[PDB]
Design a protein around this ligand. Sequence first.
Ligand SMILES: CCCCCCCCCCCCCCCCCC(=O)OC[C@H](COP(=O)(O)OCCN)OC(=O)CCCCCCCCCCCCCCCCC
Ligand SMILES: NC(=O)C1=CN([C@@H]2O[C@H](COP(=O)(O)OP(=O)(O)OC[C@H]3O[C@@H](n4cnc5c(N)ncnc54)[C@H](OP(=O)(O)O)[C@@H]3O)[C@@H](O)[C@H]2O)C=CC1
Ligand code: SF4
Ligand code: SF4
Ligand code: SF4
Ligand code: SF4
Ligand SMILES: [K+]
Ligand SMILES: [Zn+2]
Lengths: 145, 385, 94, 125, 206, 114, 94, 289, 176, 112
Amino acid sequence: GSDRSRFLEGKRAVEDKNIGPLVKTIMTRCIQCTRCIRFASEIAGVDDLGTTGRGNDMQVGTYIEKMFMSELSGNIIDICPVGALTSKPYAFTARPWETRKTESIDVMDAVGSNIVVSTRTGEVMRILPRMHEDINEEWISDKTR
Amino acid sequence: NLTLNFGPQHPAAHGVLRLVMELSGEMVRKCDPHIGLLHRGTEKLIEYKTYLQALPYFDRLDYVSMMCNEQAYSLAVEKLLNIRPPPRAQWIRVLFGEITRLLNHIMAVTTHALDIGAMTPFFWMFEEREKMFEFYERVSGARMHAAYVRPGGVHQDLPLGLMDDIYEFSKNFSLRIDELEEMLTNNRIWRNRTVDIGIVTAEDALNYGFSGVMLRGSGIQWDLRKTQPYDVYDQVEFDVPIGSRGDCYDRYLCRVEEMRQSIRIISQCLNKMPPGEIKVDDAKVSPPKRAEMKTSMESLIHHFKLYTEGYQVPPGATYTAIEAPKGEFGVYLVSDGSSRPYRCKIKAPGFAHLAGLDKMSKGHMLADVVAIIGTQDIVFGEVDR
Amino acid sequence: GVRTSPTGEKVTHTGQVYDDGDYRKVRFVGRQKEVNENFAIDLIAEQPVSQVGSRVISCDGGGGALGHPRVYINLDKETKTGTCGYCGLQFRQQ
Amino acid sequence: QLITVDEKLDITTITGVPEEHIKTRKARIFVPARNNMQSGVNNTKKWKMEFDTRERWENPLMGWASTADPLSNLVLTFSTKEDAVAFAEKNGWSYDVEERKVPKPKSKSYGANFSWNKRTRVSTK
Amino acid sequence: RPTVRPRNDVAHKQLSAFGEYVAEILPKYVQQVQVSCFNELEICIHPDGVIPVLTFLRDHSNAQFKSLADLTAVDIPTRQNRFEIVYNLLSLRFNSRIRVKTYTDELTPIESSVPVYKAANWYEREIWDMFGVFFANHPDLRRILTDYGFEGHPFRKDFPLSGYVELRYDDEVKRVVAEPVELAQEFRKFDLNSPWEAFPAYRQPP
Amino acid sequence: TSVKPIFSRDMNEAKRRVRELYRAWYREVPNTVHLFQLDISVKQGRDKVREMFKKNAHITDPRVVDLLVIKGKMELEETIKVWKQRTHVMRFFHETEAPRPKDFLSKFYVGHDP
Amino acid sequence: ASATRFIQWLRNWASGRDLQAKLQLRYQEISKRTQPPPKLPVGPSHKLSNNYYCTRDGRREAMPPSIVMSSQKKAVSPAPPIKRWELSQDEPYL
Amino acid sequence: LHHAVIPHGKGGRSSVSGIVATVFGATGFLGRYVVNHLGRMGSQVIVPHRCEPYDTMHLRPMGDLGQIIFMDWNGRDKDSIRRAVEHSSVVINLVGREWETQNFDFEDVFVKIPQAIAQVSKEAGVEKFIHISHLNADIKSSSKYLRSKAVGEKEVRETFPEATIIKPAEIFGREDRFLNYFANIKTVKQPVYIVDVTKGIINAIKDPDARGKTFAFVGPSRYLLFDLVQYVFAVAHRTTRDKVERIHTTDKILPHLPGLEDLGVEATPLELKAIEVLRRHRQPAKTIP
Amino acid sequence: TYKYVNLREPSMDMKSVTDRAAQTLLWTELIRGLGMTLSYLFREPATINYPFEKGPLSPRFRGEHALRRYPSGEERCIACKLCEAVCPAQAITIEAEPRADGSRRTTRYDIDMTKCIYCGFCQEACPVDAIVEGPNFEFSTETHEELLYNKEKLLNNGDKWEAEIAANIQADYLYR
Amino acid sequence: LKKTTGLVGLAVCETPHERLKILYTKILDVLGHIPKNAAYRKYTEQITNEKLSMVKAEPDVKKLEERLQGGQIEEVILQAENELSLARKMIQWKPWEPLVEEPPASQWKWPI
Ligand SMILES: CCCCCCCCCCCCCCCCCC(=O)OC[C@H](COP(=O)(O)OCCN)OC(=O)CCCCCCCCCCCCCCCCC
Ligand SMILES: NC(=O)C1=CN([C@@H]2O[C@H](COP(=O)(O)OP(=O)(O)OC[C@H]3O[C@@H](n4cnc5c(N)ncnc54)[C@H](OP(=O)(O)O)[C@@H]3O)[C@@H](O)[C@H]2O)C=CC1
Ligand code: SF4
Ligand code: SF4
Ligand code: SF4
Ligand code: SF4
Ligand SMILES: [K+]
Ligand SMILES: [Zn+2]
């Protein structure tokens, strides 16, 4: 992209939806890519996320006040390209450039999902999926996460 | 052959330089500099920094010529980035490059005189240095390690009223050089300590890798500001002083005359300073203005990324050199395509100059070695790196 | 919200204090524990909520380019106020 | 003139590395996993060599993370695993090599979203 | 265009022509010649050609590279010859610069260039010190920058940043003693590289 | 398998240089002890030289041996020229480092490292 | 500046220069330590149109080196011989 | 344990040894070696000092940042003793002069002060207590120094029963008042090296078997005072009434007591270290089997 | 263009030769050098009367660090860690978590002032003017530990120096 | 006859034309020992003959310096001496022969 702005108007602001204790939403950052909608419907098999409204006011969410509690729900954090959906437990604790990445395995079940353990200064910061086509692909369970 | 190696059977500490000399009576027969006493592994540390993070390391090399060291590094990065700084930044860099030359030659000449007894010009001229430290502090907030010259231009614009004060300082400075010359130039004791001392031929100087005054003292007509100009040096007029005897006295005269020519350049920089921005108007290299950063989405992203990852430099390698106050100062800088330099070899002019100390000191007495080390103008921040 | 513990040591705004059996408090013997007594959490709570007449308001923290990056705050919900993510000022719609 | 040396290359004795950090270390040779927070794949091109993590403890004064491992930050880059294996063997490190994971080709069809009789039909866009 | 460094086609063509000139004259040693987009000429040669190639460039009438600006090494662990030796020469007669590059490994000696440039003396000592490259027929090869008895070559990419030992004065033995390095705060490694390619013009085929 | 020799064309010629360096070090130790006023005996100094040599008894590459000899001669020069100070010479003896035990149980009690 | 006319004469004669006109201590000729606020200009890229970054992208114009030979007629010099310098007419000799 | 005192690291300057030691009398000959060894492995050391801060500057480089803490104390003031020990896990007493002063006699420094430290330490909860006495301590002794040591040894053992009491012979070392005492000038002496004593104290801190015990730190060999003194002058190429009594007191032999070898410390012969001590002043001495 | 610094021909006529003979024997240049030092004895010295007089500094001066607040008293820092990323010396250490009221705030903010190079990069990188280098330069200490600043020390510096820090930022922020 | 060359250690030449004629002819004699198809011979002869003609054509020294573009005439003489020295070394090196050895596959690949 370009290195400067020529937008001289005020910006849209969107209210924040609540969808459980795991995924925090700041939906003003959403870019309406519908990755989360497609993941919930196709991978998780839950049709509770969609778009409401039209045009510039189109909003991603549940319309009603509803939690998105699925054993795969945390994966929408990874696939959201922006900070619209983020890990609530991880909030504010670290920055990516300072974390050490340890490639490891999950022991919360017998699948053996491949993971990355992000550490910083000798402390575990979070757990991310590690791509393995023959096991977990690029997902993990919420318990693993 | 008495020996002075600073060890058992010789109780004395050495300091910044450990000179192992073997003397026959009064004459020096071998001079063996032992360095590394200020080696800090700067070149290795730079490999862990981003290009902006590594910039302050160059203030701390020739720590008498700080902004000139910044300029050499900035030119190398700009060359690899394929960008250029704007004209006002280039004129500011030439202005402070010549102020920095005054800072260095005052230090070089007056401490050289102090090391051999003339202790008074050091005090008169270090008041001038103190005033020039104020110009550094007013543009950057630091008296020495300004970190002011950066790839893309300079960090900040001159504060209002700074140019007027630089004019006032320059208007009187030549009379201070005259007072320095009244103490040294014609003094028979000064001439007896420097005339026909450390004579180097034009061919030996080239093959030994000398640069700067160490070349021009022996008559070689070379100055990178003329032959390989950079920034806006091809728009100011000045004369290159040239020696004839290639000894310590001619190099002292060259350095004094270069201070006068530096004032001559500074006079043109003040008059020809153009308007405009001070860093390249390319926010993928130079951070945006703070007011832009706080209103524009693009500006905030680029500020964020410039101050964390830094800008990527296209892969390549360059040897870039400038006419620093002490001679040719250059960097061989290797880019691997990322935001941290892969290798940064620093070419310090004093490194080759010191390696020629044994050659230059042949046939001289012990106290002449003080004058030879003085005439080479050695800072061990750059020699050891 | 300066508050001393049962051992007498002041608790910092980050909730730090040495517990009873911690030898590390020997460092304060004969000296003092630097504790800043202006708790930001208590100070921002003293600020009144601004009443505004639009669904969206912008905040830059005051002082123009001397504040924080300008952000736009949605005021559609009525259960709670809109809080600035930078400076913590609160806004409500009227 | 050249000589014939059929022995294996082994520079352990002329590198200056203490014995501790040669025989007791375990190098890991691998291609880094794509950070799953981003779609860019540019950090998955080259092979890396890192060593086994060792103890970090809290500095009593400030609580900073202290270390006694001189190799804790050492990470090397290689064009191929063969280059990395060669480097680890001449330096005398025991190493593990992990095969590169490359995403397999997918079959993508936009028209599949609107299938007449298959479950691939999406219910929202 | 104000923000873009201008090209210089005249210098690029001239340096290319001299690149062919050198390659035709010394085919026994020249392995590659290239000119960068910012007009720097590099001659990559077989290590046997150090003395012949440098002597030719110093003494030949159409070269006359009398000054050795710098001589350094670069450690590249992925290459089987990890060390790249770089000579940067300056010609005052023709106001030009040239870079000459060769390679070696931890055991192969390079011929000393002190006979061609006296400046190479300390530069080659520094390379030995920092990288462990041995220079044959050097009049005085020994460390120059590191502490006496220092083990290792700090500028190698696999030498750790803070080294292996650290010094302190020990009152029990009344002297400065060396001990294995322990850091109150470990250096914090940062993973800064972006996962998105920046320069398509430098892409390597898969 | 064709490589440029450093000094020695085969291990026989390399072993000769090793023995000559050993003799030079062996003769130097009494001088080093006296010149540096070391608190070790000449026997300790010589046993240290021997232990330093035996550490590399397993090498079979004549180029590696040559570098070990080149480094050893440099160390000997630094010692003879008194470029080293007494601190440098005594770093061979690790006098302020607590013995680190090497059996499994001792390592297990103290920490995690092998 | 405060020196008496006799002392001014004494030091003027001893140095051989009229020192008063070029004093090395600064008095009222210095700039104010409070200055009016600036308003700095903006570079050539501060445009609302005809300004696509791809037209002004220096880094993306850099190219790999041009290989003129790889191991895989008149003589030339690296550049034309350097022209001789001309002696200064400002002051050829000191 | 408490989370803050679990050992960490590789036992170096920046490591955490888990020891929080208060060392009384740390500004003397034995204290400097004790403090140095404690800070080598990363212990928190509290140094109560009576003297100028200037006289304690040689202890500052012995510990990483924050590891050496200095407090003022007065031997007669119990509160100042309490302040210095209430956070420690071990208290080490090395207080004592070799002469009497108008303000402090041997009873003050060898009975009253050790007992006051022991009483405050017991009340404050300190688990380990190490008290230095003398090998030749005896109430039947000619030397008032040694008579006071015997009484103070009794009171320490009764006030802090678990205290580890150490009884060294005369200690030789660079700053000693033994070999340096002779070089500046019937009896059998068995002197011990300063570093051995330092290791013994440190090992006693780490050994649970040492609690409640009394040790005798003696060198490997016994010498005749005349023969030893002759050795000193040969190596060096060459005072009070009580001091002379002590130097003429044959070193007791106490086989029942444990010694340095019990704490894993091999005693060092005087011949290996005599030059170290006496080189600054510029044939063995018959041993008694 | 060049000039010669020492390419002069000394006249060998009797008047010139006698001028150099009188110089050699009567020490004229040495006495002229005495005049210059005499003129300085009667010049006013350039010394200032520290600590009652201070050397001049500008608003940009880089001194002791401080953490700033908003006019309401809320901390400006939001634990973005841009300062920590750019620090050339790695002198800054930051930890953060959601505050009790949900704000993004630091629980640790240390500066090792003995690692710091006083480069000012942290105040350039900060997006909210939270970390600054203030005008204080008289904070030398008697112990090493006193120079390892934590967040409580840094906030106290801000409260202590805010009056001057705000005025200095007011003077220079239009150049940033 | 100039008083000085200006360069320390480089002495004036009283007979620069005769000195250069002897040097250039000596170079052309050494180059006769090199194979004809050697690029060093073909190029060095070409430039040597070009310089040798200029010495023959121009008898005035200062005008000759202008044609030679080699600085002072004593600098031109020094360069001819270096060329003669180089030519003798080239006969022993024989740099016209084929490349001694190809570099490993990725020796000159950057970035890696
Ligand atoms: C009618 C018949 C009459 C017959 C008698 C006639 C005699 C008068 C005519 C002759 C005059 C004699 C002069 C006597 C003074 C000594 C002169 C002298 O020796 O100067 C030469 C000396 C070295 O000079 P140089 O440049 O090195 O060259 C020669 C070396 N080959 O130069 C030097 O001395 C070196 C300088 C050393 C001094 C430096 C530090 C002090 C300088 C300032 C001091 C000012 C004088 C103070 C006066 C004190 C009064 C009490
Ligand atoms: N070294 C030996 O030969 C032997 C020593 N010991 C015992 O070992 C211990 C230390 O030995 P050493 O270190 O040689 O003794 P030192 O005299 O060398 O050091 C004694 C320490 O006690 C302190 N001290 C003395 N009197 C007082 C007092 N009245 N109030 C407070 N502090 C005081 C001194 O502090 P300041 O500097 O302030 O006076 C000093 O730090 C002593 O108890 C001694 O009896 C036992 C056997 C042999
Ligand atoms: S994945 Fe993120 S950006 Fe895309 S629609 Fe969902 S919330 Fe919005
Ligand atoms: S980090 Fe990314 S998602 Fe978050 S505000 Fe910046 S551009 Fe938007
Ligand atoms: S001034 Fe520079 S070195 Fe100091 S904390 Fe800020 S960024 Fe780091
Ligand atoms: S001080 Fe500024 S840059 Fe540093 S973490 Fe806080 S807000 Fe970010
Ligand atoms: K996300
Ligand atoms: Zn706000």
